[PDB]
Amino acid sequence: KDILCRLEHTTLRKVTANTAIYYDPNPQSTVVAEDQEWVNVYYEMPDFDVARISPWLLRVELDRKHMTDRKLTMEQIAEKINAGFGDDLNCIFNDDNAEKLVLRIRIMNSDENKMDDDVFLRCIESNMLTDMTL
Amino acid sequence: GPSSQNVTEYVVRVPKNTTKKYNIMAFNAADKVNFATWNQARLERDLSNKPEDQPWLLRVNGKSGRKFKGIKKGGVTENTSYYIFTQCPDGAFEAFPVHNWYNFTPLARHRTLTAEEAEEEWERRNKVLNHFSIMQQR
Amino acid sequence: FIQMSVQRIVEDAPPIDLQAPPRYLLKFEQIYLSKPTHWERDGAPSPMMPNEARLRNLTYSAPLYVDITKTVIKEGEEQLQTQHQKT
Amino acid sequence: VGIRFCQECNNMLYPKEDKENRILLYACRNCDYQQEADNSCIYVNKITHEVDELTQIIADVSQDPTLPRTEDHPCQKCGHKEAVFFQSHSARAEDAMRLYYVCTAPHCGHRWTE
Amino acid sequence: PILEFLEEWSMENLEEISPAAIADATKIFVNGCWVGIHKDPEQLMNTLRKLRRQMDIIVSEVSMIRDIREREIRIYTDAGRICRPLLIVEKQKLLLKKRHIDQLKEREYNNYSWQDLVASGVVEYIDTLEEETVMLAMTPDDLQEKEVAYCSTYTHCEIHPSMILGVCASIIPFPDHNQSPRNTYQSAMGKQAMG
Amino acid sequence: GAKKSAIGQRIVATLPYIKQEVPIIIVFRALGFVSDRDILEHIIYDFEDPEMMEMVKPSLDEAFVIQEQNVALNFIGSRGAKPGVTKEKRIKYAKEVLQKEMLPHVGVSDFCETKKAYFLGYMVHRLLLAALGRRELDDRDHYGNKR
Amino acid sequence: AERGELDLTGAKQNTGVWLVKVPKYLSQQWAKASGRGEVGKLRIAKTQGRTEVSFTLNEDLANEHPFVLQSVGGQTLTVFTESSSDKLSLEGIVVQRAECRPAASENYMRLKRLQIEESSKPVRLSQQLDKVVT
Ligand SMILES: [Zn+2]
Ligand SMILES: [Zn+2]
């Protein structure tokens, strides 16, 4: 089965419950308390993003059953997203203990510091769901 | 009280001919029309064709107010009739047939891309970027 | 088709208007159909039996006639109307 | 997720941010009208889209003579014994064999899934 | 005649309603033309069915289809629609009774004919589209009778299941005991038989 | 594409006597329905449903340039059976096609625009249901669809 | 004050009118009377929690018409008149919508059958000729 998983193509669409885009002006009080519990931990001593951060947020919910079936790890997914987009995007994910798996995505700080800031994130959402390979 | 068992009866009157014809003016509920703001109202036939066989044009409060265009109803009430009941001091209801049915739709008042200019935007068939910026140039 | 469509098609046809001054109008009012008839070489009509058509290689067809009303306007404020029954 | 139209020319309202206030706004393209955004969510994409089929079901289906009727699943609301059951037969589910029950009692369009 | 009755009935014209009211109401289609909407489809269908069975305003060859799930009522009156006569079933009972059979038995010198059955409202023509909404019984002797509960709501019944065959397939004896390709082969062969 | 993928799938209409596909929203504009709310009212009968609303968004963006009925009519006339020497002829020809050549069974008169808009929206509404999977695709072999 | 200006006094008075659809026979009878001065009487009965509206046909005119009300929130209907003097005026705003239905259930269809027969009277159809036209 390990070989099977290593061969069968897996894109972010397969193991994604849903994707939502919020304006998220303040990173601290991002959307709701659920993210507040763990988002702060990353923001208590954040690195590589203290300079600036894009206003728009891309929240991704990942199905636990699908993730378990392919034995995928959130850290691995973040590394893959980071590897694909480099520093263009900042990926924040919660611990696997939480019943809900979340992964916040934003755009590089340097750009924040031409098409649009909300449409472009929409393109990335579609780009990551299908084109990106996990 | 009396309202719990109130009974009312009124007579119906159908005058043969009326000096003024009766029509029906309709507005979309989502339009959120407000007759209080209708300080002035002007109703004239449209000039697009260039009379009785042409759509109506409604203008409210001149250019400042919303402009609506009236269109005669295509359906014909050959097997149906429409009447309006108006309260009168005598208390006998009066029924007036509707000469025609017209539907009025609001017209937007803002810089609209010209047909010649719309051709230029057609080259950006799907490569259009920042849809908001399109009207900024206009 | 014979009872309704043929009449409907003829009725639905717009009146023919000629103007080139005098103005001529033509309208097809009613459609008439007779029994399947055969004409001998001498011109005498006779009912065409289906067996006869099979043997003599004829076509089992019924003559078709239409009422046409011809109204002419000569610009003299005078209208002359004539009907050519069963044309 | 919600859809809004400007009150001026009744055209589609699209999201937009103002740098000065850093607050989400909905602005009409051909109108220049702007509105304060209260949802704060531009859109939500449901890949699984596990939409509750009960909402999609119409209570009038109980009037269908071809649907099977079972008396072993009484209505939870009115208690009517007779009920009509059927499958979703909705595409994009990728799997559908469960039964959806609708109360046959008139004026009680209760629907449930066992 | 159908459109005029619909206007007379509590059907709202499409040009007079607001778009918001369409969601709850059911669209009414006559010969593929969306004429209007109705807020009481069940009553309208029953009224329409009653009229056709009585041959009052609706002729026998008119198809009335109610898509309950889609909230649409489609009425068809054009030509080219294939339909077959089916016995009407009400409350698991055939509207055809012994009296109709007895009247038919004396088909001649009685003026009682098939058209009387249609006028009587015991047998009606059903097209393909309306058949989808019809719960039909193969035979009354077995499917209508009380038994293991399979279908307690039957709308029509076959006059005879053997009628599904055509002219050539109808001359095959015991065609239900032969392989289907053989039945087709005979159908062609029968066309070439001398006589 | 970055833009094509994000918006999704757009709806186009193939009217008779027109060489090329016409975006659906343009046809509604040519009929006399300019505001998005008015057009969506004929296509989507329940704005409370968000899934169907998102389906028509890409189509709206496609016809965003055209915001006038006359502009929509000229655009259709541009693809007419014969080239239009002047804009007036193009608009007149476009009205001619829509008036009678488009959905003639719905109507063939000059006051049938509203009737055709509803039917055209129903066709779009039917298409959306199939795309959304809420309605099964029609079967050509079904003889209920045959004459 | 202008020819194209529309009078809005009726709207300012909050005048309320009722929109009622009636069958052909009721309208035909009223047309037959030619407006003698009366065609019937409308009766409204209001109970503790329900309202009943019906119309009674004149006995002379004949030689019950219950009224069903409809919600008006779906549209805003106003009545405007075009006087023969070319002075358009707004009569008022419709405040209630009702529909008139017949009382007869089955015997009414007999009248419709005659009405359909009357409608089909001018429906011309082809005629058969015993002899060929000469
Ligand atoms: Zn606007
Ligand atoms: Zn119940």
Curated annotation (Swiss-Prot), chain B:
Domain of life: Eukaryota
PTM entry text: Phosphorylated on Ser and other residues by TAF1 and casein kinase II-like kinases.
Modified residues annotated as Phosphothreonine in this record: T114
Induction record: Up-regulated in response to enterovirus 71 (EV71) infection.
Compartments it resides in: Nucleus
Signal peptide stretch: none
Subunit structure and binding partners: Heterodimer of an alpha and a beta subunit. Interacts with GTF2F2, CTDP1, TAF6/TAFII80 and URI1. Interacts with GTF2B (via C-terminus and preferentially via acetylated form); this interaction prevents binding of GTF2B to GTF2F2.
Function description: TFIIF is a general transcription initiation factor that binds to RNA polymerase II and helps to recruit it to the initiation complex in collaboration with TFIIB. It promotes transcription elongation.
Membership in a protein family: Belongs to the TFIIF alpha subunit family.
Protein name, entry field: General transcription factor IIF subunit 1
Region of the whole protein represented: 5 to 180 of 517
UniProtKB/Swiss-Prot annotation, chain D:
Alphabetized InterPro entries for the sequence: DNA-dir_RNA_pol-M_15_CS (IPR019761), Rpa12/Rpb9/Rpc10/TFS (IPR012164), Zn_ribbon_RPB9 (IPR001529), Zn_ribbon_RPB9_C (IPR034012), Znf_TFIIS (IPR001222)
Zinc finger feature spans (C4-type): 6-31
Annotated binding of Zn(2+) 1, by residue: C6, C9, C28, C31
Localisation: Nucleus, Nucleolus
Major location category of this protein: nucleus
ZnF start-end (TFIIS-type): 71-113
Residues involved in Zn(2+) 2 binding: C75, C78, C103, C108
The keyword Kinase appears for this protein: no
GO molecular function: DNA-directed RNA polymerase activity; nucleic acid binding; zinc ion binding
GO terms under cellular component: nucleolus; nucleus; RNA polymerase II, core complex
Keywords linked to the UniProt accession: Acetylation, DNA-directed RNA polymerase, Metal-binding, Nucleus, Transcription, Zinc, Zinc-finger
Pfam family, one: Zn_ribbon_RPB9
GO biological process, one term: transcription-coupled nucleotide-excision repair
SMART domains: RPOL9 (SM00661), ZnF_C2C2 (SM00440)
Function: DNA-dependent RNA polymerase catalyzes the transcription of DNA into RNA using the four ribonucleoside triphosphates as substrates. Component of RNA polymerase II which synthesizes mRNA precursors and many functional non-coding RNAs. Pol II is the central component of the basal RNA polymerase II transcription machinery. It is composed of mobile elements that move relative to each other. RPB9 is part of the upper jaw surrounding the central large cleft and thought to grab the incoming DNA template.
Description of how the protein assembles with itself and partners: Component of the RNA polymerase II (Pol II) complex consisting of 12 subunits.
Family membership noted in the UniProt record: Belongs to the archaeal RpoM/eukaryotic RPA12/RPB9/RPC11 RNA polymerase family.
Listed name of the protein: DNA-directed RNA polymerase II subunit RPB9
Annotated source species: Sus scrofa (Pig)
Swiss-Prot record, chain G:
GO molecular function list: DNA binding; RNA polymerase II general transcription initiation factor activity
Record's keyword annotation contains Cell inner membrane: no
Alphabetical UniProt keywords: Acetylation, DNA-binding, Nucleus, Phosphoprotein, Transcription, Transcription regulation
Subcellular location: Nucleus
Its job: TFIIF is a general transcription initiation factor that binds to RNA polymerase II and helps to recruit it to the initiation complex in collaboration with TFIIB.
Family designation: Belongs to the TFIIF beta subunit family.
GO-annotated cellular components: microtubule cytoskeleton; nucleoplasm; nucleus; transcription factor TFIIF complex
UniProt KW DNA-binding keyword: yes
N6-acetyllysine carried by residues: K21, K32, K121
Shown residues within the full chain: 2 to 150 of 249
Protein species of origin: Homo sapiens
N-acetylalanine: residues bearing it: A1
Any single biological process term in GO: transcription by RNA polymerase II
Main location: nucleus
Designated name of the protein: General transcription factor IIF subunit 2
Gene designation per UniProt: GTF2F2
Highest taxon, organism lineage: Eukaryota
Subunit text: Heterodimer of an alpha and a beta subunit. Interacts with HTATSF1 and GPBP1. Interacts with URI1. Interacts with GTF2B (via N-terminus); this interaction is inhibited in presence of GTF2F1.
Residue list for modification Phosphoserine: S126
